[PDB]
Structure formats: C-alpha cells, structure tokens
Amino acid sequence: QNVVNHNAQALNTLVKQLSSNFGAISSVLNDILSRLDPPEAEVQIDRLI
Amino acid sequence: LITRTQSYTNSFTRGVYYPDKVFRSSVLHSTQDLFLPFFSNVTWFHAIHVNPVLPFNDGVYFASTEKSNIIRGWIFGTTLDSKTQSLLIVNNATNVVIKVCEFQFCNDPFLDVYMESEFRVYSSANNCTFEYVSQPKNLREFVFKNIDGYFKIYSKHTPINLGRDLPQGFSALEPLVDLPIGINITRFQTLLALHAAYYVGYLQPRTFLLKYNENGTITDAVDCALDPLSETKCTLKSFTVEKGIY
Amino acid sequence: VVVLSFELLHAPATVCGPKKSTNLVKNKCVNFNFNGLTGTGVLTESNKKFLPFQQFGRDIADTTDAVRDPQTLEILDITPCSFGGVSVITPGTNTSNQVAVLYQGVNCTEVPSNVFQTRAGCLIGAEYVNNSYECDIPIGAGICASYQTSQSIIAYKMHLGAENS
Amino acid sequence: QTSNFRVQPTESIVRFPNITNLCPFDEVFNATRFASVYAWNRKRISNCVADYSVLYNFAPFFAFKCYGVSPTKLNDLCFTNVYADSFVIRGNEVSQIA
Ligand SMILES: *[C@@H]1O[C@H](CO)[C@@H](O[C@@H]2O[C@H](CO)[C@@H](O)[C@H](O)[C@H]2NC(C)=O)[C@H](O)[C@H]1NC(C)=O
Ligand SMILES: *[C@@H]1O[C@H](CO)[C@@H](O)[C@H](O)[C@H]1NC(C)=O
C-alpha cells in the first residue's frame, strides 16, 4: 500500500503548482495575455515558465 | 428610557458560515477567514424599559431568542453625525428597508408605535446614496462583515428546545445579502420598538477545517489554534488520528 | 442641452452596460464563459443538486467540474476534451514501409481502414487474428503485434508457453 | 512515441443573467420643460444597467461629442455613478459648452 500512496501524492503536488502565482501577477495565463501589453507580458510568461 | 446590563457566557462552537459559493461533495476543506473562535466569551445584554454604542471591529456575531416584534434592526456608522455616512436597517411585518444617508441620530433611538414613526431614531436625512427594499422557541443568528466596500450579512433561524440559549450542536449560516456601499463602519447599535436580551461576539482571523457531506452542506468543523489535538487533525487533514507522535 | 459626467471613484462599480449572451450548445468541445468563469470543454447534463446560493462546483484537486447556467437554473457537467499520445509501429524499413498507428487512451469514435479498440487505446492499420504466438512488439494489456502473411501487420494475444502435464 | 493529439474547439459560448432594471435616461431626455441655465438640474444615476443606444430615439441630432470616452465603447465600461445636467440655452451658445 505504501508504494501506491507515494505515487498518488506526487501527482497531486504536480497539479498544485499549476494554481500558483510564482511571483507573477496571476496564475491564469489568459488573463495576463488579455490585460497586459507585450513588453510587460514577456517577463511574466518567462517567470511562470 | 432603556437601561442595559451585561453578563458573560460561552460560545460553544457557534458562528460558522459558508465562506464561498462553491459546491463541494464529501470533502474536508481548509479555509482562512474571519471566524468566531470556539469556546469564546460573549456578552449577554438585558435591555429594560420601565445605552452607549458598541464597537465594530472585523465583524460582529449577533444572536437573539426573543419572540420577535421587539428587535427591529441596527444602526452602523463611524460618527453617527451629519458629517459622515451611516447605514440603517429596519424590519416590519411586510418588508426590509436598508438606507445609507447622512443621518442626525438621536441618543437612545427607538421606533414609536401608536403607525410606526421614526422621529425618535433621527432628525434629518440629508444626502442619500443607496436604498434597498426586500422581504422581511426560536433562535436567530446573524453575522455582519465589511470588506473592500461590500457589506455582507449571513443569517440562520433554528428552532431550539430545552431552556438553554446557545445550545450544543452545529449549524451553518447561509449568505443572506451583499451590499455595495463603500463606507466606513466603526460602531453600531440595536433598535427597539416601544408602544429585550441579546448576545454579542466579535470575529478574529483564524484558520478552520470544514467538513462537507454528499449533499454539499457543512456538518462539522475544527478550529486549528484551540488545542494541540486539534492542530494535529489539521496537519493530517483528517478528523480522526491514529496512535503515534506527529 | 444634456451633459453626462462619468465618474470612476473608489467604490464598487454599480453602473455597467448590458452583457449579451449567446445560445447554449451541448455535446461539443467549445470555449465557454459562464458569468466570468472562462474555460473550454464539453457540457453535459448533470445529476448533481447544488444549494440555492452555490454557483459552480470544484473537485478534490480544486478544478471546476460543474456549473449553473445563469438564465435557466440548471446544472451542467464540464468535461475536458480528448488528448493523448500517438505511437507508430513499423516492421523496420529493411522489411516494409507499412505502419500502424496507436492512439493512447481514446475511443476509436473520437475524431481520429482497420480500426480496433484495445485497453491501451485505438489501433488503426492492424488486423486482429485469434490464434496466439510469442510476443514480438508489445502494445499493452496482453496485446502484441507482428508482421505475418500477403504480408501485413497483425495483432493477437500473448501466449505464455507450451502446455505440459 | 512520435506525436501528440488534442481535439480543438469549434465554437464560443457566453452566458450572463437577464437584462433588467434599466437606467432612467428617458426621464432626462424627454420631460415637461428643461431647467433654466443659471438654475440647472443635476440628476444622480446609480445602481442600474445603462444602455447608451436607446438615446437616439429622443433626438440627439444637432450635436453629439464625447470627450475622454468613445461613443461606441460606452456600454462596455463600468462606473461608480453618472450625472446628467440638463438645461435650455440659445442656439448660439452651444459652442461655449466645452
Ligand atoms: C430570462 O428570460 C427568459 C425569457 O427570455 C426566461 O425564460 C422564461 O421564463 C419564464 C418564467 O416565468 C417561463 O415561464 C418561460 O417558459 C421561459 N421561457 C424560455 C424560453 O426559457 C428566463 O426565466 C429569464 N431568467 C430568469 C432567471 O428568470
Ligand atoms: C476468436 O475465435 C472466434 C471463434 O470462436 C472468433 O469469432 C473471433 O473473431 C476470434 N478472435 C479474433 C479473430 O481476434
């Protein structure tokens, strides 16, 4: 059972980092595209990447 | 002429409300918000007619068990003067009216019944910004909060048995209304109708662990900062813990 | 003469213009915007029952999976659109230029000739015989493929070994 | 393993609640008599939905100029409140209102 649990846990962590700002304006990328100008959008995209 | 007397009593894990509008099914969820801490000391007021104002900070929990028609509403403000905006809520048998204006409130306001007149609540009204009208033993609980220019009210009505007020059990408060008023609240007062006892508590920042059943209703909660045992339940994200060291 | 003055003060914005809504379409992979909730997927009829004040539902992984329609107060299930890996099976260019294609984890009816449904996915370009052999090219869940007679790609079940008593 | 496959979307759907509780622009544009310049009127409009398209029924023909905004992208914006000042002047003083 232990082995199974470990694997499951890992997957959840990999999902949870998706919903994180990581020091950017927001976690959602489409909003950053819509609201912001190409100069300032690039740094946010690179930070998320 | 109304005289008020104070005593103290215990919360007994009351004041839980839905913090979101998200449906969840058979899940334990951890939230961080303004809550009334478990087993806290709340004030019991006895008003008799044969009354200074109260502070408002980070929201208020209000409870009553009167047989209605005595308590009608509340006054919220920061100076209760003509120079600042104030909010007023009055209930009758037919409707509810919420108004924000520049009132000149009287000391010790009350509704006069002979027709219900409001010449003993304020004297002048001046500029009015927002108005709203809607629909109107037993225990009635309300939670009042004010964040980012929105005034939120949650409510709940519960038929209680025995003779004890604030009984033991769990009951969550559904959202009642949200008002975009954008004013400042620091003090509040209760209104009476003349031809009363109530409970007051204060909210604090706190993290809670809530349990949702399969129908989407909150059935139980855990306060993290109460005991060492309740903190383990929140680190483990579970309501039961097995023997060991954590 | 009428003069209109627009003011953006520090308060919630309570004077907005109308927001028009289009029709509702189901059983298709579409982009959707439900009252500000933006996403994409397939919307199907739901059997869930929200509380009167709840607007959308989230999963244990904190992903939106149900939504309430703002005009007709029904519940809809949101489903992600199909995706998967594409693998190519060949006998080696020294033997033939024919190939078969595996679509991992999708039904053969989802917008993908000999077609066959396996546990691993949809197999296109192979013939499914019955009699078994030793495994040559593993596919998954006991299915293997080979180049046999004219000559063509065939799929079969793995054979463990000769029976003895 | 060579390629990746994903089905693409084919349509766009937007859903919002019903439109109701319209702002009272008709009262301002059509009334009994407009005020007298020195004593003009100011009406506060808030907590409603404003559609700046029904205006043309009440005859905005002689002049229609919009500083700071765009006559088309008006109902695409949100404001805390809007005021309407209406009066009567002579046909030669319109240029002075700017
Ligand atoms: C929004 O408007 C639509 C009509 O344009 C409403 O749909 C009708 O609602 C009435 C309610 O009395 C029903 O009797 C009709 O059968 C409905 N017709 C259709 C075509 O749906 C809709 O109810 C309105 N939205 C809300 C929240 O009431
Ligand atoms: C297995 O044999 C049966 C005959 O009983 C046949 O119907 C079936 O198609 C065979 N399976 C194959 C060819 O994959």
Curated annotation (Swiss-Prot), chain B:
Effect after changing T3N: In strain: Gamma/P.1
Region (Disordered): 112-126
Disulfide bridges in this chain: C101-C128, C224-C234
UniProt effect for mutating N91Q: Partial loss of biliverdin affinity
Domain BetaCoV S1-NTD: 1-236
Mutagenesis / variant outcome for changing T65I: In strain: Iota/B.1.526, Mu/B.1.621, B.1.1.318, Omicron/BA.1
Protein name: Spike protein S1
Protein's gene: S
Residue span relative to the full protein: 18 to 313 of 1273
